Design an enzyme around this catalytic site. Structure first.
Site, PDB file in Angstrom:
ATOM      1  N   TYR A 180     -13.867  13.356  -4.035  1.00  0.00           N
ATOM      2  CA  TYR A 180     -13.283  12.552  -5.017  1.00  0.00           C
ATOM      3  C   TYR A 180     -12.780  13.815  -5.927  1.00  0.00           C
ATOM      4  O   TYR A 180     -11.681  13.382  -6.195  1.00  0.00           O
ATOM      5  CB  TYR A 180     -13.434  11.633  -6.253  1.00  0.00           C
TER       6      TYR A 180
ATOM      7  N   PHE B  98      -0.981   5.979 -10.346  1.00  0.00           N
ATOM      8  CA  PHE B  98      -2.016   5.427 -10.005  1.00  0.00           C
ATOM      9  C   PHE B  98      -2.698   4.838  -9.459  1.00  0.00           C
ATOM     10  O   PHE B  98      -4.400   5.196  -9.823  1.00  0.00           O
ATOM     11  CB  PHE B  98      -2.311   4.296 -11.371  1.00  0.00           C
TER      12      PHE B  98
ATOM     13  N   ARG C 235     -19.390  13.997 -22.761  1.00  0.00           N
ATOM     14  CA  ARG C 235     -18.112  14.275 -22.469  1.00  0.00           C
ATOM     15  C   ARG C 235     -17.293  13.849 -23.912  1.00  0.00           C
ATOM     16  O   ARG C 235     -17.326  13.063 -24.605  1.00  0.00           O
ATOM     17  CB  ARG C 235     -18.647  13.315 -21.525  1.00  0.00           C
TER      18      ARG C 235
ATOM     19  N   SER D   5      -6.746  14.356 -12.964  1.00  0.00           N
ATOM     20  CA  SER D   5      -8.794  14.179 -13.076  1.00  0.00           C
ATOM     21  C   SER D   5      -8.697  15.429 -13.958  1.00  0.00           C
ATOM     22  O   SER D   5      -8.486  16.991 -13.189  1.00  0.00           O
ATOM     23  CB  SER D   5      -9.410  13.393 -12.171  1.00  0.00           C
TER      24      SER D   5
ATOM     25  N   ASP E  41       1.413  -1.524  -0.342  1.00  0.00           N
ATOM     26  CA  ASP E  41       0.359  -0.329   0.297  1.00  0.00           C
ATOM     27  C   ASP E  41       0.934   1.469  -0.543  1.00  0.00           C
ATOM     28  O   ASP E  41       1.998   1.230   0.760  1.00  0.00           O
ATOM     29  CB  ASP E  41      -0.974   0.258   1.028  1.00  0.00           C
TER      30      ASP E  41
ATOM     31  N   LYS F 138      -7.835  14.878  -6.163  1.00  0.00           N
ATOM     32  CA  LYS F 138      -7.739  15.446  -6.477  1.00  0.00           C
ATOM     33  C   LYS F 138      -6.771  16.588  -6.531  1.00  0.00           C
ATOM     34  O   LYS F 138      -6.128  16.315  -7.017  1.00  0.00           O
ATOM     35  CB  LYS F 138      -7.693  14.422  -8.199  1.00  0.00           C
TER      36      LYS F 138
ATOM     37  N   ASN G  35     -18.468   3.687 -15.192  1.00  0.00           N
ATOM     38  CA  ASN G  35     -18.717   4.507 -16.416  1.00  0.00           C
ATOM     39  C   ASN G  35     -19.684   4.316 -17.326  1.00  0.00           C
ATOM     40  O   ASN G  35     -20.078   2.736 -17.031  1.00  0.00           O
ATOM     41  CB  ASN G  35     -17.438   4.484 -16.625  1.00  0.00           C
TER      42      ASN G  35
HETATM   43  N1  LIG Z   1     -10.416   4.965 -14.155  1.00  0.00           N
HETATM   44  C1  LIG Z   1     -10.951   6.110 -14.474  1.00  0.00           C
HETATM   45  O1  LIG Z   1     -11.850   5.999 -14.862  1.00  0.00           O
HETATM   46  C2  LIG Z   1     -10.293   7.220 -14.312  1.00  0.00           C
HETATM   47  C3  LIG Z   1     -10.645   8.903 -14.417  1.00  0.00           C
HETATM   48  C4  LIG Z   1     -10.559   9.588 -13.953  1.00  0.00           C
HETATM   49  C5  LIG Z   1      -8.490  10.168 -13.263  1.00  0.00           C
HETATM   50  N2  LIG Z   1      -8.255   8.204 -12.757  1.00  0.00           N
HETATM   51  C6  LIG Z   1      -7.381   8.204 -12.017  1.00  0.00           C
HETATM   52  O2  LIG Z   1      -6.703   7.216 -12.907  1.00  0.00           O
HETATM   53  C7  LIG Z   1      -5.684   6.489 -10.954  1.00  0.00           C
HETATM   54  C8  LIG Z   1      -6.704   4.489 -11.360  1.00  0.00           C
HETATM   55  O3  LIG Z   1      -8.010   4.729 -12.982  1.00  0.00           O
HETATM   56  P1  LIG Z   1      -7.916   3.629 -13.401  1.00  0.00           P
HETATM   57  O4  LIG Z   1      -9.041   3.668 -14.020  1.00  0.00           O
HETATM   58  O5  LIG Z   1      -6.605   2.107 -13.904  1.00  0.00           O
HETATM   59  O6  LIG Z   1      -8.764   2.740 -11.714  1.00  0.00           O
HETATM   60  P2  LIG Z   1      -8.281   0.980 -10.705  1.00  0.00           P
HETATM   61  O7  LIG Z   1      -9.388   0.861  -9.490  1.00  0.00           O
HETATM   62  O8  LIG Z   1      -8.408   0.119 -12.076  1.00  0.00           O
HETATM   63  O9  LIG Z   1      -6.593   1.315 -11.074  1.00  0.00           O
HETATM   64  C9  LIG Z   1      -6.124   1.702  -9.416  1.00  0.00           C
HETATM   65  C10 LIG Z   1      -5.341   0.425  -8.757  1.00  0.00           C
HETATM   66  O10 LIG Z   1      -5.424   0.993  -7.670  1.00  0.00           O
HETATM   67  C11 LIG Z   1      -4.516  -0.316  -6.519  1.00  0.00           C
HETATM   68  N3  LIG Z   1      -4.571   0.785  -5.465  1.00  0.00           N
HETATM   69  C12 LIG Z   1      -5.725   1.218  -5.143  1.00  0.00           C
HETATM   70  N4  LIG Z   1      -6.098   1.802  -3.710  1.00  0.00           N
HETATM   71  C13 LIG Z   1      -4.241   1.514  -3.141  1.00  0.00           C
HETATM   72  C14 LIG Z   1      -3.492   2.020  -2.417  1.00  0.00           C
HETATM   73  N5  LIG Z   1      -3.774   2.581  -1.171  1.00  0.00           N
HETATM   74  N6  LIG Z   1      -2.221   1.836  -2.317  1.00  0.00           N
HETATM   75  C15 LIG Z   1      -1.900   0.489  -3.389  1.00  0.00           C
HETATM   76  N7  LIG Z   1      -2.188   0.572  -4.877  1.00  0.00           N
HETATM   77  C16 LIG Z   1      -3.459   0.656  -3.768  1.00  0.00           C
HETATM   78  C17 LIG Z   1      -5.800  -0.870  -6.635  1.00  0.00           C
HETATM   79  O11 LIG Z   1      -5.927  -2.462  -6.123  1.00  0.00           O
HETATM   80  C18 LIG Z   1      -6.392  -0.569  -8.498  1.00  0.00           C
HETATM   81  O12 LIG Z   1      -5.061  -2.180  -8.729  1.00  0.00           O
HETATM   82  C19 LIG Z   1      -5.908   7.181 -10.268  1.00  0.00           C
HETATM   83  O13 LIG Z   1      -5.745   7.926 -10.242  1.00  0.00           O
HETATM   84  C20 LIG Z   1      -7.490   7.453 -10.601  1.00  0.00           C
HETATM   85  O14 LIG Z   1      -8.124   8.620  -9.512  1.00  0.00           O
HETATM   86  C21 LIG Z   1      -8.812   7.722 -13.105  1.00  0.00           C
HETATM   87  O1  LIG Z   2     -25.421   4.608 -15.861  1.00  0.00           O
HETATM   88  C1  LIG Z   2     -24.981   6.048 -16.659  1.00  0.00           C
HETATM   89  C2  LIG Z   2     -23.476   6.273 -16.902  1.00  0.00           C
HETATM   90  C3  LIG Z   2     -23.598   7.215 -17.108  1.00  0.00           C
HETATM   91  N1  LIG Z   2     -24.542   7.860 -17.149  1.00  0.00           N
HETATM   92  C4  LIG Z   2     -23.814   9.021 -18.288  1.00  0.00           C
HETATM   93  O2  LIG Z   2     -22.852   9.336 -18.553  1.00  0.00           O
HETATM   94  C5  LIG Z   2     -21.107   9.836 -19.612  1.00  0.00           C
HETATM   95  C6  LIG Z   2     -20.093   9.817 -18.579  1.00  0.00           C
HETATM   96  O3  LIG Z   2     -20.559   9.471 -17.258  1.00  0.00           O
HETATM   97  P1  LIG Z   2     -19.532   9.245 -16.222  1.00  0.00           P
HETATM   98  O4  LIG Z   2     -19.863   8.802 -15.103  1.00  0.00           O
HETATM   99  O5  LIG Z   2     -18.647   7.629 -17.231  1.00  0.00           O
HETATM  100  O6  LIG Z   2     -18.134   9.640 -16.603  1.00  0.00           O
HETATM  101  P2  LIG Z   2     -17.978  11.594 -16.075  1.00  0.00           P
HETATM  102  O7  LIG Z   2     -18.320  12.042 -17.798  1.00  0.00           O
HETATM  103  O8  LIG Z   2     -19.046  11.886 -15.625  1.00  0.00           O
HETATM  104  O9  LIG Z   2     -16.689  11.094 -15.694  1.00  0.00           O
HETATM  105  C7  LIG Z   2     -22.020  11.327 -18.363  1.00  0.00           C
HETATM  106  O10 LIG Z   2     -23.000  12.343 -19.219  1.00  0.00           O
HETATM  107  C8  LIG Z   2     -22.984  10.280 -17.642  1.00  0.00           C
HETATM  108  O11 LIG Z   2     -24.186  11.529 -17.241  1.00  0.00           O
HETATM  109  C9  LIG Z   2     -25.550   7.761 -17.644  1.00  0.00           C
HETATM  110  O12 LIG Z   2     -26.585   8.141 -18.573  1.00  0.00           O
HETATM  111  N2  LIG Z   2     -25.740   6.330 -17.092  1.00  0.00           N
END
Ligand SMILES: NC(=O)c1ccc[n+]([C@@H]2O[C@H](COP(=O)([O-])OP(=O)(O)OC[C@H]3O[C@@H](n4cnc5c(N)ncnc54)[C@H](O)[C@@H]3O)[C@@H](O)[C@H]2O)c1
Ligand SMILES: O=c1ccn([C@@H]2O[C@H](COP(=O)(O)OP(=O)(O)O)[C@@H](O)[C@H]2O)c(=O)[nH]1
Ligand SMILES: NC(=O)c1ccc[n+]([C@@H]2O[C@H](COP(=O)([O-])OP(=O)(O)OC[C@H]3O[C@@H](n4cnc5c(N)ncnc54)[C@H](O)[C@@H]3O)[C@@H](O)[C@H]2O)c1
Ligand SMILES: O=c1ccn([C@@H]2O[C@H](COP(=O)(O)OP(=O)(O)O)[C@@H](O)[C@H]2O)c(=O)[nH]1
Ligand code: NA
Ligand code: NA
Ligand code: NA
Ligand code: NA
Lengths: 338, 338
Positions: free
Chosen positions: A149, A80, A231, A124, A58, A153, A199
């Site tokens: 959330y 990440f 989006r 983000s 962790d 960030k 999502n």
């Molecule tokens: N997934 C998205 O839609 C998204 C969108 C915007 C920004 N981000 C950012 O990207 C990053 C990862 O996104 P993701 O999509 O790969 O999600 P994800 O959950 O698939 O990957 C994150 C990983 O981090 C691990 N993890 C979580 N907390 C931890 C901790 N305290 N110590 C060690 N490992 C830890 C989880 O086990 C997982 O494998 C985060 O910074 C998230 O905020 C992701």
């Molecule tokens: O069940 C769902 C999930 C998502 N969305 C829409 O899909 C777009 C992408 O949203 P998501 O939660 O995937 O990411 P966001 O843009 O809010 O990160 C946005 O307009 C949400 O309003 C929706 O209508 N229904």
């Protein structure tokens, strides 16, 4: 270079590690498996064509972080690891602040002790907050994020920013992105949500596959071309690429380098659904609901800066995002094996 | 009630503990002694006329926090523990985020485990950020704080706010104040800066006492009546009082209760110096410098809300703040004994 990839076994990280290995870098993955499975590991190796070291642990454990950093002579860290479920963030704020805020602080603290000064942060686009000026540009001041959330960030961004100011030799990238989707072209890696997918894409994929009845479209009333929310969607492979470039090009270049990673255009909900219906060969079931809590009519990223400064831009289309998703979903219906 | 006072041995906390004891409450002090000395303890008891329990330890130690909370059947927590040197905050950002942000998170996490739901946070008026609308009112949205110190305070406010939202039974006060000064009327407790004093009053007191040559007045060019910076000064005894009232009146009243604690009027640098020259019986030496980094021409708090809702308002004057300071400085030139 020698890179530590926190959260490396997750969605974006796994993809990123494969691209990293392919570039011949030495990869150390640090993950706590709270949102991913050990089974992805061998896939990473295979696809990457190289072995990445894996450490279960962790980010909040500063001691271990420092050990790892030293043990592997880390040059750069791509971060990440964290929690990213917006709705859950509202219900369990503390957990988000701890994992994200404290989690990064413990990590950068260790870097400090280990004399590692190159960092790439998975940021983000929620940091822009309520911006009626779209698309968002890096020169725009941040706003106030809607959820715990989003706030966590921006908090992290702020902390890294002050850090760089106090320790000017540090090179820190803040990579701002919106909605990552798709999967590795192999169909052997992809997004593996446990439970109700957060999502759109994955949710829709579940509706497609039979798991879900219908997609609820939150609002059909917007000031948009089709009335649904617009989006920015970015293919996971492109995102992973942006991560590698940023890491290679910014290493040892002092400063806080902010870049939006995105396609530079927006797509509506219906656009995404149609794309998917097309990829899976059958009409995606959906219905309309009224405006979800905290959502805006339309927004996307301006990604000119990355194009210009990093020579990076997306190459995958919305249709590929859909196909790729369908492909992974199709070849591995039960996601990663336990 | 049974109250845990983090940072209780420091400047504001010590004063607060005496007022607490006097009100007959049961006081448990938690302090890490990074900025205070055990020697103040007996003074607290004497002045308070009751014995407060003292525990040496750190807010960052969640385990200990929980133990303490349980061991003493704590009902409410007044949180003063943290770092507050603005300039140092710019030089050592991490330390500030850890002690303040992580420090509070670990504390509230423990409360969560111990089922303690009443909290009073020592906030700061720096959260208002750049506001040309003075005086500041609680209904005003926050701005963006200038230093890592200010930012950490707003971050904490935000975190507590989301927490209360997720756990609506919690009662949380955010007490925003500007510049605390003065000392207990006994002259036996007061502000004991180690090293170059941060704030005006103490600095000036040092100039007075002989320790310092002259006070540098950063800017004589401002759009103020006398050209120097106007700020809000609040007597430490009044601040302590506001803390007790808030604690007694808000316990078990769910919500986030924000209150500005201040005199409601501003005073210039020259005003403060003149007040002090008067209290110590001799002209305070000073000279002018040009505008310090990050400072604004004038600001103060609007404290109507506290008056109205808590029936609280200041009772001490600027002159008393000065006299009291001179008194403590005079009776105990070497501050607290090691
Ligand atoms: N997934 C998205 O839609 C998204 C969108 C915007 C920004 N981000 C950012 O990207 C990053 C990862 O996104 P993701 O999509 O790969 O999600 P994800 O959950 O698939 O990957 C994150 C990983 O981090 C691990 N993890 C979580 N907390 C931890 C901790 N305290 N110590 C060690 N490992 C830890 C989880 O086990 C997982 O494998 C985060 O910074 C998230 O905020 C992701
Ligand atoms: O069940 C769902 C999930 C998502 N969305 C829409 O899909 C777009 C992408 O949203 P998501 O939660 O995937 O990411 P966001 O843009 O809010 O990160 C946005 O307009 C949400 O309003 C929706 O209508 N229904
Ligand atoms: N002093 C000011 O001018 C001022 C102005 C605005 C807001 N505040 C806030 O008031 C609080 C205390 O102010 P103060 O004037 O009494 O300063 P102070 O230093 O005299 O008191 C704080 C005390 O907290 C202790 N402490 C610090 N970090 C700790 C940790 N991690 N664990 C346990 N104990 C810890 C220190 O040893 C000290 O005794 C802080 O929240 C500060 O941000 C103070
Ligand atoms: O050596 C000093 C210390 C303070 N100040 C001024 O005194 C006022 C109170 O500042 P302090 O640092 O005590 O608190 P602030 O109002 O910034 O918290 C401000 O206008 C400062 O500009 C000054 O001129 N010289
Ligand atoms: Na510096
Ligand atoms: Na599965
Ligand atoms: Na809830
Ligand atoms: Na001393």
């Amino acid at each position: 270079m020698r890179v530590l990839v926190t959260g490396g076994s997750g969605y974006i990280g796994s993809h990123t590690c494969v691209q990293l290995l392919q570039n011949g870098h030495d990869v150390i993955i640090l993950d706590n498996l709270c949102n991913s499975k050990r089974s992805v590991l061998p896939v990473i190796e295979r696809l990457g064509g190289k072995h990445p070291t894996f450490v279960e642990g962790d980010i909040r454990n500063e001691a271990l972080m420092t050990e790892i950093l030293h043990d592997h002579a880390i040059d750069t860290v791509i971060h990440f690891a964290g929690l990213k479920a917006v709705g859950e963030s509202v219900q369990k704020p503390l957990e988000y602040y701890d994992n994200n805020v404290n989690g990064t602080l413990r990590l950068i603290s260790a870097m400090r002790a280990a004399n590692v000064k190159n960092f790439i942060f998975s940021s983000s686009a929620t940091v822009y907050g309520d911006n009626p000026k779209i698309p968002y540009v890096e020169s725009f001041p941040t706003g106030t994020p809607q959820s715990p959330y989003g706030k966590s960030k921006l908090m992290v961004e702020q902390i890294l920013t002050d850090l760089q100011k106090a320790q000017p030799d540090w090179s820190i990238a803040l990579l701002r992105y919106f909605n990552p989707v798709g999967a590795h072209p192999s169909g052997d890696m992809g997004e593996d949500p446990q439970g109700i997918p957060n999502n759109l894409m994955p949710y829709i994929a579940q509706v497609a596959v039979g798991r879900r009845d219908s997609l609820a479209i939150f609002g059909n009333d917007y000031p948009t071309e089709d009335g649904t929310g617009v989006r920015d969607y970015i293919h996971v492979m492109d995102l992973a690429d942006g991560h590698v470039v940023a890491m290679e090009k910014l290493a040892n270049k002092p400063g806080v380098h902010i870049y939006n990673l995105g396609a530079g255009v927006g797509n509506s909900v219906l656009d995404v659904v149609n794309a998917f219906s097309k990829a899976c060969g059958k009409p995606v079931n959906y219905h309309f609901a009224p405006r979800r809590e905290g959502d805006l009519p339309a927004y996307w990223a301006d990604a000119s800066k990355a194009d210009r400064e990093l020579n990076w831009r997306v190459t995958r289309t919305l249709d590929e995002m859909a196909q790729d998703t369908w492909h992974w979903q199709s070849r591995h219906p039960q996601g990663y094996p336990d």
